[model samples]
Target: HPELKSSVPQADSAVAAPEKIQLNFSENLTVKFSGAKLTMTGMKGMSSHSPMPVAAKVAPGADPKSMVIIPREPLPAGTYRVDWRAVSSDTHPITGNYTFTVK
Candidate 1:
């Protein structure tokens, strides 16, 4: 399995809006079986909540060990969840999720 090494907006980080979400793994990934999703899970001062799917495209990075998700438009301030799955030589897909904030 391809273990996630790092990400664009580090986990639990609050930063300015990012143009894209990037995930780097410890092993070379199989693009066909690796991808990520962006979901807006919350916002400032919100009592009611509904998970909103952000439009984006997931693709393999130039580096085989990396993958990225490019949002169709720039993200607005909110808490987002990045859910990802990666498959490497082992053929077992590994999955994980992390959250970050755009402030």
Candidate 2:
């Protein structure tokens, strides 16, 4: 597993409901095998980004050690967790999660 580097809607932070979220990792990811898991939680596990767009990196499994998430619609106000899992270039499996707030 690789270490979390940085993100768009960063951890423990409150920001506008953006159209996209990006996650940078310490290592390269396998796009064909790596992906992010996101869920909006309003205590009811409800969400407005239900039909949310999927997240992917710019270079597609190479170059940048990052992933991008684009919501199909504007994100609703809530607490969301953006988690990810992927195999590194060295074939090491990695998994991690983080939470951010949209207000």
Candidate 3:
């Protein structure tokens, strides 16, 4: 089973904004299918924005079960949520989420 092992910015916690977010799963994932979603509703200025699905990739020379998301811009001070879905080679999908506040 593909299980999420960890995440940056962690769940239900607050921390300074980072360059991006990372997801760690227990099993290897397939490219082009496994990815993550970010919601910026908690952003100080952007609440109308819908769930934006960002691009993700298993970095070269990195763990196959690890994925990273690089945002187009720096996240502002506010609460944010990372909802992710990962698909393995077998086409199975595992999904989970976490919330964090940036300051």
Best by TM-score, which number? 1
Model 1 regions lying over 4 Å from their true place: 45-47
Q: After superposition, how far is residue 13 of candidate 1 from its true place, in Å?
A: 0.1
Q: Please provide, for model 3 over 2-49, each residue's C-alpha lDDT reduced to its tens digit, 9 standing for 90 to 100.
A: 788888777888889878787787888785777777766566556565
Give one digit per residue, the lDDT tens place, for model 1 in 1-103: 6799999999999989998899999999988977888998988766446788898999889998999899986788999999999999888999999999999
Q: Give a tens-digit lDDT track for model 2, residues 1-103.
A: 6677888888889888866778788877776777776767552365554534333333352246777776655567777787777667777777877788888
lDDT of each: 0.90, 0.69, 0.73
- Global CA lDDT computed for model 1: 0.90
Top-lDDT structure, candidate number: 1
> Please, what is the TM-score per model?
0.93, 0.74, 0.80
Over 4 Å off, model 3: 44-61
TM-score of candidate 1 against the unseen true structure:
0.93
Candidate 2 colliding pairs: 1-94
The alpha-carbon lDDT assigned to residue 90 of candidate 1 equals: 83
